[PDB]
Amino acid sequence: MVKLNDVLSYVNGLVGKGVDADGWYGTQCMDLTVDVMQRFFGWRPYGNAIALVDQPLPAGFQRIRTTSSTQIKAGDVMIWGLGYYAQYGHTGIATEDGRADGTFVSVDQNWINPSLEVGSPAAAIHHNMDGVWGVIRPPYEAAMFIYYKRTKQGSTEQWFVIGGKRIYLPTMTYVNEANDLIKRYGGNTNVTTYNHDNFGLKMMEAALPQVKV
Amino acid sequence: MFIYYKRTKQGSTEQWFVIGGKRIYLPTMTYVNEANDLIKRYGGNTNVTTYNHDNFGLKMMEAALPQVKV
Amino acid sequence: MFIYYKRTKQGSTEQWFVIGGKRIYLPTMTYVNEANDLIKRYGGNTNVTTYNHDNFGLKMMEAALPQVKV
Amino acid sequence: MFIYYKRTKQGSTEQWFVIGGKRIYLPTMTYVNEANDLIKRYGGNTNVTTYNHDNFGLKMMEAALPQVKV
Ligand SMILES: [Ca+2]
Structure with missing residues (x-):
C-alpha cells in the first residue's frame, strides 16, 4: 500500500x-x-x-x-x-x-x-x-470496480461493476461489501466520478446492463 | 473464476463456482475438484470466502451472475 | 477492455472498443478520448492492432462480442 | 481468452476457443492460428489441455459459456 x-x-x-x-x-x-x-x-x-x-x-x-x-x-x-x-x-x-x-x-x-x-x-x-x-x-x-455518477439532479451515486453488469449501491453497507469483493477477488480500486452526460459513462451504461439488489 | 461457500438459511454449507460470468452450484466433491483444476489451469482466484445467505456481497454476486445447472 | 482498428470494405479505418464482452464503434474523436481514458483507469489492454474486415480473428471477435450503440 | 481440446464421444479431437464469455469451435487451422494470435495480443492464457467429452470440468465450461458460430 x-x-x-x-x-x-x-x-x-x-x-x-x-x-x-x-x-x-x-x-x-x-x-x-x-x-x-x-x-x-x-x-x-x-x-x-x-x-x-x-x-x-x-x-x-x-x-x-x-x-x-x-x-x-x-x-x-x-x-x-x-x-x-x-x-x-x-x-x-x-x-x-x-x-x-x-x-x-x-x-x-x-x-x-x-x-x-x-x-x-x-x-x-x-x-x-x-x-x-x-x-x-x-x-x-x-x-470488478466502483465508479461514481453525478446525476442531473445534483447527487452523487455509487455504482458497482461486476460480472459484466452494473449495480447501484443504495447504502454505505452496500459500498463496504462491494469494496470487500474488490479486495478478495482482485478488482480495480480506481474511483472516478462521471457526469451523467459523459460519453465514457454512456458507453459503460450501454455495455453493462443494470441489475438490482 | 473462483469458488465461494454459502451458508444457506437452513444452515447447510454449499460450494459455488463462478465462471464465465455465471454461478454453478457444485453438487459433489468430484465437481469441486474439477472446478479447482480449472482455477489452477486458467489463472483463477484461489480465495475461498464463506458468505451467509443474507450477506450483501453475496446478494450482489447472485444478482449479477446468473445460475447455470451442470 | 481494449481498442482495435478495423480497415473496412469501403477503405476507411474505424476505431472499436471492447468492454463488458461487447463492442462499441467509436465514430469520433470524442468517443476515442473517452475510451482511452477508460483503458487507463481500469487496466485495459493497450495493444492496438489493425484488422482487415475479412480477417478471421476479427470475425471471431465480432461473433463473440455483440455490438452495442452509443 | 484460451483454447482447449475436446475429445468427442465418436473419437475425434475438436479445438475450441474461449473469448468474451463464449466458446467457438475452430473449424480449420487458419481459425486456430488467428485464435492463437488473439491470445498473444491480448494476454490470454496459453494453457492447452485436452478434455474427454465426459469430463465434469468440460461440462461446467460448456454450460457456462454459450457457443457462438464461426
Ligand atoms: Ca487546469
Whole structure:
C-alpha cells in the first residue's frame, strides 16, 4: 500500500513547476490534488476544491473537520472552505505535521501569484488556519470496480461493476461489501466520478446492463 | 473464476463456482475438484470466502451472475 | 477492455472498443478520448492492432462480442 | 481468452476457443492460428489441455459459456 515518503518526495519535487490535470485554466489548486491523488491512489476527486468537503471518498480515506493545526498530518489533502474560500475553495498537500503555533506547511498551486487564467506553479507555503475547513487523510502504510455518477439532479451515486453488469449501491453497507469483493477477488480500486452526460459513462451504461439488489 | 461457500438459511454449507460470468452450484466433491483444476489451469482466484445467505456481497454476486445447472 | 482498428470494405479505418464482452464503434474523436481514458483507469489492454474486415480473428471477435450503440 | 481440446464421444479431437464469455469451435487451422494470435495480443492464457467429452470440468465450461458460430 501507499508509502507517505513516496508522496512527499513527488510533491516536494513539483515545487517550482505546475501540473494541469484537466486542461482548463493551467495549473489551478485542484489540479495538484487531483494529480497526486490519481497517480498514487487511483482516485480522481471531482469538482472544485470546495467539493472536497462533502463528495464521497474511496475506501480507506478519512475526512476530518479541523479546529487546530495540530490535527494536520503530513500527506493530508488540505481543504479551505470558510469565509472567502466558501465559494470555490482551495487545496494543496500538507508536507509536514501541523505545528503547535497554529501553522502548517503545504505545497499548493495558485496560492502565490494567483491567476484565474493560467494558475501558478506549486510552492511550499507556511500557512495559518484562516479559512481552513479540514483534511482528507489518504490511507498511507504504517499509520470488478466502483465508479461514481453525478446525476442531473445534483447527487452523487455509487455504482458497482461486476460480472459484466452494473449495480447501484443504495447504502454505505452496500459500498463496504462491494469494496470487500474488490479486495478478495482482485478488482480495480480506481474511483472516478462521471457526469451523467459523459460519453465514457454512456458507453459503460450501454455495455453493462443494470441489475438490482 | 473462483469458488465461494454459502451458508444457506437452513444452515447447510454449499460450494459455488463462478465462471464465465455465471454461478454453478457444485453438487459433489468430484465437481469441486474439477472446478479447482480449472482455477489452477486458467489463472483463477484461489480465495475461498464463506458468505451467509443474507450477506450483501453475496446478494450482489447472485444478482449479477446468473445460475447455470451442470 | 481494449481498442482495435478495423480497415473496412469501403477503405476507411474505424476505431472499436471492447468492454463488458461487447463492442462499441467509436465514430469520433470524442468517443476515442473517452475510451482511452477508460483503458487507463481500469487496466485495459493497450495493444492496438489493425484488422482487415475479412480477417478471421476479427470475425471471431465480432461473433463473440455483440455490438452495442452509443 | 484460451483454447482447449475436446475429445468427442465418436473419437475425434475438436479445438475450441474461449473469448468474451463464449466458446467457438475452430473449424480449420487458419481459425486456430488467428485464435492463437488473439491470445498473444491480448494476454490470454496459453494453457492447452485436452478434455474427454465426459469430463465434469468440460461440462461446467460448456454450460457456462454459450457457443457462438464461426
Ligand atoms: Ca487546469
